[PDB]
Amino acid sequence: GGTPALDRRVQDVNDTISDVKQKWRCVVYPGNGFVSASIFGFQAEVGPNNTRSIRKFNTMQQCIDFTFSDVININIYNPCVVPNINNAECQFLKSVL
Amino acid sequence: TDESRDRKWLYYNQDVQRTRCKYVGCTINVNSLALKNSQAELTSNCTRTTSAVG
Amino acid sequence: LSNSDRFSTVPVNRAKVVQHNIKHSFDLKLHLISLLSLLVIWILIVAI
Amino acid sequence: MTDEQIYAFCDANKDDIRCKCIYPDKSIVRIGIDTRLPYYCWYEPCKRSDALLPASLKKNITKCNVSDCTISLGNVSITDSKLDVNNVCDSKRVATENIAVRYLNQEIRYPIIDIKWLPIGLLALAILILAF
Amino acid sequence: AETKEFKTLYNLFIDSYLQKLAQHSIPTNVTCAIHIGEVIGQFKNCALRITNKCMSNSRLSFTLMVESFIEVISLLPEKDRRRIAEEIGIDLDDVPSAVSKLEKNCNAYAEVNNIIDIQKLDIGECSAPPGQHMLLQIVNTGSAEANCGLQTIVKSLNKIYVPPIIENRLPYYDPWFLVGVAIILVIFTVAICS
Amino acid sequence: HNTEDSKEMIDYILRQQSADFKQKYMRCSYPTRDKLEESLKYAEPREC
């Protein structure tokens, strides 16, 4: 009986996060393929002048690979905060979340 | 800043500052516990951590 | 984390723990006791 | 290492992943502020094991999403029972009816009569001379 | 004695509700407390479990409570599950994410804070199969109305009949009478043979 | 004493001090720009 055996030596990101909105969730972006998203925004990449530009994935496979690998998302782009534009990107992020 | 502690051991400035402080903690207090062939277990894991328990 | 050291990162085979607790434990010898009691009864009733 | 050494080292190398949430971009800080969630509670380099953090960052991360729930029992008296006060206020789920078995390193007592019986037992044998 | 918990309908409901609360746990600034003046337990295998959850969102609390209750009565017979449903005040055909009669009845505890104050508590008889214990829970939540729903559902599930384990072992008292009679009758048969 | 006049007198006395006294004993009351930025990065008072 009892609880199932656990291997803590392998780390799960979903174990620590208790809020569904904080977990990164790859979603379909009508503007360009697919892009990672969360309450903090979309995962971004370094620009030429240290700018924030959201990554674009042609297929769900690439989003699944990049989001859940061992790499760390240093760059975060939030359309509702960083530009403060509050354009359709902000509404899209709100609807996804 | 404990109720069990006697206030003669604190200065008056410490005594007046004892009741006006905020404790965002997670505590268990039992005044008395008489165990007769029992196995009590008072655990309080309270800040959000990994759900799975080894 | 006041009980962090009592939990093991590696999985625990609790079945093996119980098997070892039973292997290395006192053995009430009911078979030997019953055989000796039967022998005592037979000797005290029939042999004597 | 001390906090001043931490600051000097991280100013020497400001792009190192090891020190990225001690000196994060203003973008991350203001995203955290505008979400009502401090950045050091969710930003991945802070969660990193090898990341170096000063005293202030540590004592502010230690208050990340901490709840305030208390249990105040009185005079408890239980006999032949089990008391399980959980006071659990997080996503972690207590393992109910999880039998915690340890290694019973039992030490088997042996049927050795106190050897002070050795003289008296001899006396027992001696009384056969009464039957001769 | 480390014994297993004897699973029972209300215990399953409480544990499922607690798991759902934990998996939707959200930080809150409200103080939730349990204060019991006296706890008295004098019967064996009467396990006591004081779990202190509290979720400020009481609407989601009733949603999860109704969901857990529905999943619990998914194994009962149809007539019994339905009649217990109207007894509690929950309708299966209604979505759990809807206000039911039970929630409306228990909204009368919205003004009071989310504290559970018991002046004195005593655990009654707990008849359980050997190797298992009867476990009683005192669960707090982030609203007194969610608590209202909790105890009313717990009482309704307690209203069912579960066959009890009957103890056939006789009370034990030191039997010197038997050995005395044996010695006397041994003397009697010695005299008879002689 | 914990009155208004007592607090004003305390502030007056502590602000009529020399540079050496403020540098040696009153570093908490006069934080540097770096500490001000660090406190702006946080939400609790700097003194915490």
Phi-psi region of B36 (alpha: psi -120 to 50; beta: other; left: phi over 0): beta
Question: Chain A residue closest to D31 (CA)?
Answer: A81
User: d(Cα B4, Cα B9) in Å, to the nearest integer?
Assistant: 12
CA distance B4 to chain D (A): 14
In 10 A of CB B46, how many CB atoms? 22
- Other residues' Cβ atoms within 10 Å of the Cβ of residue F34: 9
Q: Is A57 exposed, middle or buried (0-12, 13-18, 19+ CB in 10 A)?
A: buried
The full 3-state SS of chain E, as one line of letters, equals CCCEECCCHHHHHHHHHHHHHHHCCCCCCCCEEEEEEEEEECCCCEEEEECECCCCCHHHHHHHHHHHHHHHCCCCCHHHHHHHHHHHCCCCCCCCCCCCHHHHHHHHHCCCCCEEEECCEECCCCCCCCCEEEEEECCECCCHHHHHHHHHHHHHHHCCCCCCCCCCCCCCCCCHHHHHHHHHHHHHHHHHHC
Structure tokens at E49: 């479990």
With an 8 Å Cβ cutoff, are F42 and D29 in contact? no
1-48 in chain C: CB under 8 A from chain D: 14, 17-18, 20-21, 24-26
Provide the phi-psi class of E139: left if phi over 0, else alpha when psi is between -120 and 50, else beta.
beta
Q: Note whether D56 contacts F: Cβ–Cβ < 8 A.
A: yes
- C-alpha pair distances (Å), E140 with each of C48, E17, E121, E145: 74, 12, 15, 11
Burial-class residue D21 by CB neighbours within 10 Å (0-12, 13-18, 19+).
buried
CB atoms within 10 A of CB E115: 15
H or E element at residue A28: strand A27-28
Amino acid at D42: W
Q: Which DSSP string do the residues of D33-91 spell out, in sequence order? A: HHTTS-GGGT-HHHH-SS----HHHHHHHTTTT---EEEEEEEEEEESSEEEE----SS
Contact check, Cβ <8 Å, A16/B49: yes
Distance CA E15, CA E46 (A): 18
Q: What distance, in Å, lies between the first and last C-alpha atoms of chain A? A: 39
For chain E positions 116-155, those within 8 Å of chain D (CB to CB) are: 123, 133
Kindly determine whether residue E22 and residue B51, on different chains, have CB atoms separated by under 8 Å. Answer: yes
Count the residues in chain A.
Answer: 97
Please state whether F2 falls in left (phi above 0), alpha (psi between -120 and 50) or beta: left
Q: Which of B41, B42, B45 to mutate to test the interface with C (most CBs of C within 10 A)?
A: B45
DSSP C3: T
Is the distance from CB of A24 to CB of A67 less than 8 angstroms? yes
Structure determination technique employed: cryo-EM
The tokens 């502030």 sit on which residue?
F11
How many beta carbons lie within 10 A of that of residue D64, not counting itself?
Answer: 15
- What strands lie across the sheet with E4-5, from one edge to the other? B39-42, D82-85, E46-50, E132-137, E4-5
Decide: helix, strand or coil at residue A19: coil
Both structure tokens of E117: 């104050």
Determine the distance in angstroms separating the CA of A18 from the nearest CA of chain E, rounded to an integer: 7
Q: CA E148 to CA E127: how far, in whole Å? A: 27
- Which tokens sit at D7? 């600051």
